[PDB]
Symmetry: D2
Subunit: 312 residues, 4 copies
């Protein structure tokens, strides 16, 4: 019989993997959902999957399950312990992810990678070089979440449905991300026109918005009370676009080859996502100032990446 | 790279096939939706799928597409023209459908059949004989449509949400169909109690209800002004349960082997539908009176089937 | 209380398809269908029953009289002869203007105090007359405008660039038809101005836009198939607007809105991006279109006012 | 106007999870969250923003004061100490009765005249007190009852027989917890009495039922995972009921309804299949359960009344 199932494997069953799994189940995006428990090196944390509405068979397994899997979601990695340095955390999660990817490939997997573990841009690159798969088949969550927040906040300030707002947060989601105001529109109207022609908006309004999203990239507190809904939703959004061949434009972590003036790196940029992963990148002609900040962001990205990238 | 896509082929591009296709596109049930146009053996003679909200590639092709297709929907057949006898109409469509199934199988197809053509039960059986596939892989629409009307009508009479109503129309949808009141409940309450205990409903109320559905199986007219929405929705419902492996209970045309006291024929009975088609039939202990009417319906079914069933 | 009552006036093709789409999406709790003498009823009763039976939401549907408009939150005007392609047939306008005014008189006399949504054609004209006859605030009389054409506009652009329609943003402005304006200067794909695709990346030529715009215009009056009426066409577009209103969505829709200066024009209803919420049109988004587009827009409006002048009332209600 | 305003009192775990589900399903137009001194706030503000940001419907959310209850259509009571598995515990009931009365007193003082949905525990008792304190008709005070347990009930039955939950119809009756009654006599799978699967087809025995009912009973109080709160648990159940009301659904839900003779009991709110619409509980479907089940049901009610007697008001408002 000609079979019609989409198999997704979630490596890492901690807070993130758990949240992603629930969102997957809730949206019935995949028919087969396999959860691989990594260890005490996850996001900390069986029957908790039996409540799905639109029936999806979820079970626990091993890396062997990655053979026939279409997409594997990486969510493993630990949190920064008091004392440990940021660089030591990057190194830690870099060796965890690499090991996981090594085993995933061992099984014979030949699908698509969706990286959700942090630092996303770096782990996505390590995933790429470790799996040897084509760049377009290794997809990081990029600034999908930050962008969704960006749009909602703008929507809230101008009392409009977020769906009428189009814009992006570019780069690595953190203090270096770039609010691309030049290509942010509301009802088709450039946001800068709200400040440089209508004056219904001030310059400080944009900065406050960009900062709300900017330093929101670190607001979670005790983690046991957090829902991880944002990460679950954004990751599920990407999986869905891949599995349904949506050709959707998402600011996922994509490999650049000149677009935005950068190259040989994965980072948040508007990209068309389909059955085959990232088809191409949309290169927006952002302003010199935005390009400058984008440069700053990729520069810092590469510096940290150099501390863990493989030699071949 | 593992591919995640469901391919459905709709043979017959007349009113029915067109309506099913539109419901399919609208619900994004399949990703690849191929349309094989027969001839003047459909219902009224490419440029109309330019609205698919949820990206779905639709195109017209030959019986070739059936090779890698997962499910094929049969909708071809002509309507009774003035003068022609009912029997001659049955022979006409039996020959058409049979020729179609022969083609579809010659391409190397090995998926699942969903018969929407009328007479449904007969054609479902012919499809089974010609294709040579297992009975569980040939699925007729049975009394799915009638049952949905049946429940809505009951819901309207009692002022409740139809989702709270469970019951079925059994057999062949026509004047012989059987309204199984014995196993019809509202909010879990047997419909007979509203009559034989609360006296909030009388016998005539059921008969009128059963007759509205009964006389609805022949309540179509203009054709070009009809929407064929019911048929589109019914067929799409079945295709959806199959592709999504819902294990849903639908009164599709299933092959009986003793249940209900009948055998060797396909007729409307509540059945569990999954990715493999019909897994089993729920055999309800209907009352002697209901079983008697069912017998009558199956009896007439076989008499007409004998005039077209493949011999030896 | 939780009142979500919608009345549809006219049970012909347009009226019924709007009903099918409303039922399918379950936007209202109550859907009253009013059969008028100025419109011949179409579509079997069975197709109405199947819509309700297969509708995910349980909505109350029934045939009634104008009395139902008294406590209705929204009334949809659909009666009228179908406007066919070509130059504007003036008698068809006069016929529909007459039908529209009579119907609106009946509606107001029932004590209705909600919002009007006009789906009849010529839409812009009938919206203006509905406003004059009803005496209601302009923000509470909403025409379907260029909503349908804009949806088609984005879909075609999407197909051409092989991208998801949700990533395309742009609008068709003015009176939907041969004089409509494709605002290319404010159409983007994933944030990228459609014009860059031609004035830089050179992936599209000027002729690619023209072919696209014509595809949209050469269908602004096409009669939708009944087997598709539930999923596409005037029915869907009207339901989109009714939905934005009933859910206080604040959606940006190119409905027929009353202008008072934006786009360089005043005192007319025509297609322009507008924020639609529970009180109707809250405000109009005034895009800085190019002189060329604006000129094409001015012409569309001139054509509109010339025709409007033949049926406009001298005494408002 | 299209008024769909809901107020949630208490921003603790229960309150917030109900908010997440409400926002996710976009059931309400306006969602007000009231932080009271009787309940400690929990959950990040960021998680509220993501909920709204990823919610398909654009709902206006905001933290407010009791005065927001004046024009509210529905108020959800959620404040109270979590009831842990085991023997009731009178001090918890008394603490929450007190908390509930004070809150209900504040809500009525704002001029509220809508419907109350109680999701605090012990639900049946707090629903009875809410009815007493508010002075509203019993049909307008709705407890969440055994809805969650019923959903669980059907889900476990489905998994066991490898069928889709929607094909299963049945209910858990009475007070949800160790004394709830699984009404097997009126539980069907595709229309087939679950009992036949035992007393005929031998597809499973008496012990399969016991194992299944306990599974449901052994989680009737468990604290839901925050990462799942938006999709399952009290949040979803409460939202299901709120949805049935706002949409005048006429759904059959086992909410805490006021009995007046059905099931042989009177003057108490408890879990029973009830038709829920825009005016609250329209009527109770009185199932002809078996003497054995009714007996179990009688015991559950007796327990309820015994504990209710320790906190019931002597003067009805």
């Amino acid at each position: 019989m000609k079979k019609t199932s989409r198999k997704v494997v979630i490596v890492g069953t901690g807070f993130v993997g758990t949240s992603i799994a629930y969102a997957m189940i809730n949206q019935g995006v995949a028919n087969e959902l396999v959860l691989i428990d990594v260890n005490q090196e996850k996001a900390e944390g069986l029957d908790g999957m039996a409540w799905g509405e639109k029936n999806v068979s979820v079970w626990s397994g091993t890396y062997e399950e990655c053979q026939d899997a279409n997409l594997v979601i990486l969510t493993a990695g630990v949190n920064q312990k008091p004392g440990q340095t940021r660089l030591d955390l990057v190194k830690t999660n870099a060796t965890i992810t690499r090991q996981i990817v090594k085993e995933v490939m061992a099984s014979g997997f030949d699908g698509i990678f969706v990286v959700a573990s942090n630092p996303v841009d770096i782990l996505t690159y390590l995933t790429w070089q470790e799996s040897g798969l084509p760049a377009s088949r290794v997809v990081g969550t990029g600034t999908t979440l930050d962008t969704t927040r960006f749009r909602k906040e703008i929507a809230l300030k101008l009392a409009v449905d977020p769906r009428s707002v189009h814009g992006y947060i570019l780069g690595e989601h953190g203090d270096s991300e770039v609010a691309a105001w030049s290509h942010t529109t509301v009802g088709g109207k450039p946001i800068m026109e709200y400040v440089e022609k209508d004056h219904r908006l001030e310059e400080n309004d944009l900065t406050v918005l960009a900062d709300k999203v900017k330093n929101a990239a670190y607001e979670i507190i005790d983690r046991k009370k957090a829902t991880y809904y944002g990460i679950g939703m954004s990751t599920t959004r990407i999986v869905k676009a891949i599995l349904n061949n949506e050709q959707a434009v998402l600011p996922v972590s994509a490999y650049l080859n000149g677009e935005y003036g950068e190259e040989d790196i994965f980072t948040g940029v508007p990209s068309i996502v389909d059955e085959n992963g990232v088809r191409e990148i949309i290169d927006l002609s952002i302003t010199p100032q935005e390009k400058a900040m984008f440069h700053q962001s990729v520069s810092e990205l590469k510096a940290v990446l150099d501390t863990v990238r493989l030699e071949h």
